[PDB]
Amino acid sequence: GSCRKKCFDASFRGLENCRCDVACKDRGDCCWDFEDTCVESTRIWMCNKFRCGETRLEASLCSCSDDCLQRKDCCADYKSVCQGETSWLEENCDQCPEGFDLPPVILFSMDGFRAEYLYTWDTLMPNINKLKTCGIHSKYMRAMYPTKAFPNHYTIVTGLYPESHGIIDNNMYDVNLNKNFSLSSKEQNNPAWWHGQPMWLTAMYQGLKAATYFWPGSEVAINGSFPSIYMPYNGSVPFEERISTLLKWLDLPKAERPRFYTMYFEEPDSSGHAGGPVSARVIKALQVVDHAFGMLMEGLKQRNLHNCVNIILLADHGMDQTYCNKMEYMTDYFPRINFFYMYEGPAPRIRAHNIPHDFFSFNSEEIVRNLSCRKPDQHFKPYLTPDLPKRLHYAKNVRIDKVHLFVDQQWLAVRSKSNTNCGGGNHGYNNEFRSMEAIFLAHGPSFKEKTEVEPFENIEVYNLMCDLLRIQPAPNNGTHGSLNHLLKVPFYEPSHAEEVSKFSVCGFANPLPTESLDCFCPHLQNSTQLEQVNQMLSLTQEEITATVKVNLPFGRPRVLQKNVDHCLLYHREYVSGFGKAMRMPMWSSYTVPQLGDTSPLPPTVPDCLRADVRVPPSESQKCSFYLADKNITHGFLYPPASNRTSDSQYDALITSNLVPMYEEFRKMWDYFHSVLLIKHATERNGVNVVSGPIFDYNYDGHFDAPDEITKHLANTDVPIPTHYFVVLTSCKNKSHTPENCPGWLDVLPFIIPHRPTNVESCPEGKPEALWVEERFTAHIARVRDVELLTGLDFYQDKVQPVSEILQLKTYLPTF
Numbered sequence: 001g002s003c004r005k006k007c008f009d010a011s012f013r014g015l016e017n018c019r020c021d022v023a024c025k026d027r028g029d030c031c032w033d034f035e036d037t038c039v040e041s042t043r044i045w046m047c048n049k050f051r052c053g054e055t056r057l058e059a060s061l062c063s064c065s066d067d068c069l070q071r072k073d074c075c076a077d078y079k080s081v082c083q084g085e086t087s088w089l090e091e092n093c094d095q096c097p098e099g100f101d102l103p104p105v106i107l108f109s110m111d112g113f114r115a116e117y118l119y120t121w122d123t124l125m126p127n128i129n130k131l132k133t134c135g136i137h138s139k140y141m142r143a144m145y146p147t148k149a150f151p152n153h154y155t156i157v158t159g160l161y162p163e164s165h166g167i168i169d170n171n172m173y174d175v176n177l178n179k180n181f182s183l184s185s186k187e188q189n190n191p192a193w194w195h196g197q198p199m200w201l202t203a204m205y206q207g208l209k210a211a212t213y214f215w216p217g218s219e220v221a222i223n224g225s226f227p228s229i230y231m232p233y234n235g236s237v238p239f240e241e242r243i244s245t246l247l248k249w250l251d252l253p254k255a256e257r258p259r260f261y262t263m264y265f266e267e268p269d270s271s272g273h274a275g276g277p278v279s280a281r282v283i284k285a286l287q288v289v290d291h292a293f294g295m296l297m298e299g300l301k302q303r304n305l306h307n308c309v310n311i312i313l314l315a316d317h318g319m320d321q322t323y324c325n326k327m328e329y330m331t332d333y334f335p336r337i338n339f340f341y342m343y344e345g346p347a348p349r350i351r352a353h354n355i356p357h358d359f360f361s362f363n364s365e366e367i368v369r370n371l372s373c374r375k376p377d378q379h380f381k382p383y384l385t386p387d388l389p390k391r392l393h394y395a396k397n398v399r400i401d402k403v404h405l406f407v408d409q410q411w412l413a414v415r416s417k418s419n420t421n422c423g424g425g426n427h428g429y430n431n432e433f434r435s436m437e438a439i440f441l442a443h444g445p446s447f448k449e450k451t452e453v454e455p456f457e458n459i460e461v462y463n464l465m466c467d468l469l470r471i472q473p474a475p476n477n478g479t480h481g482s483l484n485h486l487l488k489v490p491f492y493e494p495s496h497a498e499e500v501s502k503f504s505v506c507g508f509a510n511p512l513p514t515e516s517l518d519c520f521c522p523h524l525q526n527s528t529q530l531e532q533v534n535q536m537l538s539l540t541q542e543e544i545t546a547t548v549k550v551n552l553p554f555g556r557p558r559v560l561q562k563n564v565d566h567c568l569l570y571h572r573e574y575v576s577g578f579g580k581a582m583r584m585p586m587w588s589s590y591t592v593p594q595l596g597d598t599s600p601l602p603p604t605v606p607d608c609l610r611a612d613v614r615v616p617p618s619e620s621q622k623c624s625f626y627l628a629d630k631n632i633t634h635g636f637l638y639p640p641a642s643n644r645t646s647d648s649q650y651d652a653l654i655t656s657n658l659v660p661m662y663e664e665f666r667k668m669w670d671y672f673h674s675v676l677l678i679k680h681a682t683e684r685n686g687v688n689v690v691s692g693p694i695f696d697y698n699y700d701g702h703f704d705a706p707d708e709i710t711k712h713l714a715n716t717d718v719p720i721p722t723h724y725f726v727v728l729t730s731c732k733n734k735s736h737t738p739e740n741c742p743g744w745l746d747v748l749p750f751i752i753p754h755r756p757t758n759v760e761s762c763p764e765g766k767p768e769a770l771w772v773e774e775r776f777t778a779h780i781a782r783v784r785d786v787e788l789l790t791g792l793d794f795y796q797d798k799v800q801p802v803s804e805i806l807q808l809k810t811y812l813p814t815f
């Protein structure tokens, strides 16, 4: 015989007197199968032909003995390797066993698994590829900025932007605590850094036990509590050991068995850093993680759990390649740099060197000014954080330093040329960069099968996981219901938000104005001319219904602000919502048709403004306000030169269509409406436009209350916007116009900062054709971002399921 079932038996002589004792290795008389049967069998996580039926040993990590199933310690592939059962991988695409009344949730993260890995190398990852084929598969998942591990892992489990959850980078300083946060320090375990409610506490608070294996934050007594089970972090733990512990937890008695699980792997992030995203090291790491993931599914199948668990496989961010010849140096821009401290790399920040003493005295403004437009080809742009694109939601936290550098693809910004941290993979860049996109795959009885879904953001996963466990989520930044199309039977059915402030009436009464408002239009020097022109503002009921049909084709925006007095101004070519206290419109809606001639609109007739007879002078702007205010002029919300009849431009040359605009912004503003808007209308077969002011002086992402607004027009109460929004909405099916679209819509939203100079664009002396469109593109945002910043709610009259409208409102155009 051989060593099968005779390991370490010195008294045993088999064929040709071969021996199976520990000393046979030296004497050189071992039976042929000794090493694999008796030595390597205690160092591996897999059964094989040598091990099946084996006699139990001591130091074995798992068992292939005939009693392992009753003892509950079989290796994961025992049944398929030893019992001839079909592996999970060999099974076709798709049930809970006894005691698993409800399906547990596994949240599985593979650090640095970028969406392109799954596109190019899927055939090198058969287990992951099987998950993608059989379950639900998003084109990619968008991370939050900056695309770092701790900020995004904690976003995933809280539903919160970093500015809200507190972990705004892997390295940061908090002047209030006067402490430093870093991944190698014990300060990261101070619960004071961790705000919000992570998913394992949401479950625990609502009666469901939670086990975490190495998830960021799970080793912290957040809000005073650890997870039910958690593991002190140690990256050296083999992945198979982690998977085996997860399967053991699923073997706990029902009364002790967690319902929510998290799992974390350092790969392919670690190999991405070492070798770059296209490298043998990443390829090998991708095969390793795929092997360990398969181990999990095989072990689930051994327990008949493969189709009972709702598993989500995703990642925190992607990976890009860096170069030592693509580095920007602060020494190139400052003669002395020893007075400030720099968080370096793909998403740098600059703060005072002497902290906490000079933290707030630091002249962040001068730093950003001296870094602006210094070279024509400089590969980063400095920002004060309130000036960053609003879709990043990266400003409202004292831990976010005011000075920020937004760095171009594959570049790095460092202090000095001494820096050698280059040549490998890195991340942290703009979350819209393709290289920073992450994967999201799910599978389970609650998910749809064999379904590909559009991209979505990692802030949406928290609500989804609460829906999977049928519990209520803590308040977060997801849009609940936006991921219902992932689910067979949604747990949460969304509904339209009900309007808070009802609209008033601004009907047409007297054709002459009680007050001139200090506005002048010599073209109407007589009174007969005025009465006729203003009469054009009088629309019949039939004319009101016609303009609403074309220019409000999805229904008016609803006001979710409280105690806001507003009325609707009907015109033939546009409808607006006038904010009485504000003395300017909250929104203006109009639909731009497709035209053959792409002739840019001509300039508005100048020197002609008059009052709105429908709006009383107490609630109207005065043209003298703008003359008085030397630092700001007036702009038009609805473009008057886009008139489609002989004298309809008069309908736009009224005080009710005026908004405060710095001269330099209005140049940008008018170019967009005169040139770019027309192109968008011709490409989209017409486009509906809704535009208006945004006030966010505390840069918290929410509309300001009137008493939060700190800048006003001249000596009046008329506020100056911080931003203007422009939402372009057309029919996804280009065969239809925006007003005759029975299917899905297609949106392109802008949130353009209203700044007194164009230094963000470094015009330098170039025509607007060479930088305006670039500036607007940099400030694309979601509709929901506009809703949050305005207190408005869109598309409520679009006949379509709410959850599909929620998909539309979370969509981010990318380029």
Ligand SMILES: *[C@@H]1O[C@H](CO)[C@@H](O[C@@H]2O[C@H](CO)[C@@H](O[C@@H]3O[C@H](CO)[C@@H](O)[C@H](O)[C@@H]3O)[C@H](O)[C@H]2NC(C)=O)[C@H](O)[C@H]1NC(C)=O
Binding pocket: 196, 197, 201, 223
């Ligand atoms: C941090 O942990 C504490 C627990 O120590 C959480 O406080 C608990 O919050 C829940 C939900 O708000 C409270 O339950 C509610 O109480 C009201 C008042 O009777 C009741 O009407 C509701 O139906 C619900 O039962 C609970 O009382 C409260 N516990 C304590 C001791 O204050 C807190 O929410 C956690 N915070 C975060 C951010 O995780």
Ligand SMILES: *[C@@H]1O[C@H](CO[C@@H]2O[C@@H](C)[C@@H](O)[C@@H](O)[C@@H]2O)[C@@H](O[C@@H]2O[C@H](CO)[C@@H](O)[C@H](O)[C@H]2NC(C)=O)[C@H](O)[C@H]1NC(C)=O
Binding pocket: 334, 335, 336, 366, 369, 370
């Ligand atoms: C920030 O820059 C100012 C201005 O410096 C000039 O503009 C820069 C954008 C860059 O092009 C420099 O090469 C220019 O010299 C600095 O203010 C100047 O400082 C020098 C001292 O070296 C002084 O002699 C000048 O009078 C200053 N000019 C003004 C208008 O004040 C300032 O020092 C820079 N700030 C920091 C922190 O370095």
Ligand SMILES: *[C@@H]1O[C@H](CO[C@@H]2O[C@@H](C)[C@@H](O)[C@@H](O)[C@@H]2O)[C@@H](O[C@@H]2O[C@H](CO)[C@@H](O)[C@H](O)[C@H]2NC(C)=O)[C@H](O)[C@H]1NC(C)=O
Binding pocket: 523, 602, 605, 641, 643, 644, 645, 646, 647, 648, 649, 650
């Ligand atoms: C859109 O309106 C422009 C402007 O109309 C002029 O300005 C208004 C404020 C009002 O004073 C009107 O009575 C004016 O006609 C139209 O451009 C004018 O077009 C006429 C006839 O084609 C021409 O004689 C004028 O010189 C033009 N004036 C300017 C400043 O361009 C334009 O025709 C209107 N578009 C359509 C489709 O009717």
Ligand SMILES: Nc1ncnc2c1ncn2[C@@H]1O[C@H](COP(=O)(O)CP(=O)(O)OP(=O)(O)O)[C@@H](O)[C@H]1O
Binding pocket: 111, 147, 148, 149, 150, 170, 171, 183, 214, 215, 216, 217, 219, 233, 235, 264, 266, 269, 427
């Ligand atoms: N609970 C945990 N505790 C400590 N470290 C963890 C952790 N979970 C993951 N990590 C570590 O997070 C690291 C990945 O995060 P990264 O964003 O790549 C760090 P970085 O910002 O690129 O540079 P840095 O190392 O200077 O912080 C992994 O190497 C891993 O060791």
Ligand SMILES: *[C@@H]1O[C@H](CO)[C@@H](O[C@@H]2O[C@H](CO)[C@@H](O)[C@H](O)[C@H]2NC(C)=O)[C@H](O)[C@H]1NC(C)=O
Binding pocket: 173, 178, 179, 180, 341, 353, 354, 355, 356
């Ligand atoms: C947090 O880390 C910073 C460096 O990242 C420390 O900064 C030092 O601050 C002291 C005075 O506070 C200065 O004398 C040193 O020159 C600073 N060092 C550097 C490298 O800038 C800071 O001390 C740390 N704070 C805490 C509480 O640990």
Ligand SMILES: *[C@@H]1O[C@H](CO)[C@@H](O[C@@H]2O[C@H](CO)[C@@H](O)[C@H](O)[C@H]2NC(C)=O)[C@H](O)[C@H]1NC(C)=O
Binding pocket: 160, 161, 164, 195, 196, 393, 475, 476, 477, 700, 701, 702, 788
């Ligand atoms: C993201 O969601 C969080 C949680 O709902 C919001 O944070 C709250 O904001 C209000 C008003 O700013 C504060 O009074 C609360 O204290 C905040 N809570 C927390 C936990 O920070 C946040 O406003 C949302 N962000 C956006 C951009 O909408």
Ligand SMILES: *[C@@H]1O[C@H](CO[C@@H]2O[C@@H](C)[C@@H](O)[C@@H](O)[C@@H]2O)[C@@H](O)[C@H](O)[C@H]1NC(C)=O
Binding pocket: 234, 235, 236, 237, 238, 241
């Ligand atoms: C980190 O992990 C290393 C690898 O072994 C693992 O940890 C030991 C303690 C056992 O739990 C073993 O089953 C694991 O695979 C250890 O060698 C090392 O000591 C650990 N370091 C720390 C600080 O815990």
Ligand SMILES: *[C@@H]1O[C@H](CO[C@@H]2O[C@@H](C)[C@@H](O)[C@@H](O)[C@@H]2O)[C@@H](O)[C@H](O)[C@H]1NC(C)=O
Binding pocket: 733, 735, 736
């Ligand atoms: C778009 O919609 C088409 C049906 O629309 C009707 O037919 C076309 C030709 C136009 O005349 C339109 O005004 C009509 O209402 C579908 O047949 C077609 O598949 C759709 N296209 C896409 C890309 O979805």
Ligand SMILES: [Ca+2]
Binding pocket: 695, 696, 697, 698, 699, 700, 701, 702, 703, 704
């Ligand atoms: Ca605000």
Ligand SMILES: [Cl-]
Binding pocket: 095, 304, 307
């Ligand atoms: Cl089954």
Ligand SMILES: [Cl-]
Binding pocket: 626, 627, 632, 633, 634
């Ligand atoms: Cl003026």
Ligand SMILES: [Cl-]
Binding pocket: 755, 756, 757, 758, 759
């Ligand atoms: Cl500016």
Ligand code: NA
Binding pocket: 626, 627, 628, 629, 630, 631, 632, 633
């Ligand atoms: Na002025």
Ligand SMILES: [Zn+2]
Binding pocket: 111, 112, 148, 149, 269, 316, 317
């Ligand atoms: Zn990472």
Ligand SMILES: [Zn+2]
Binding pocket: 112, 149, 269, 270, 273, 427
């Ligand atoms: Zn990393």
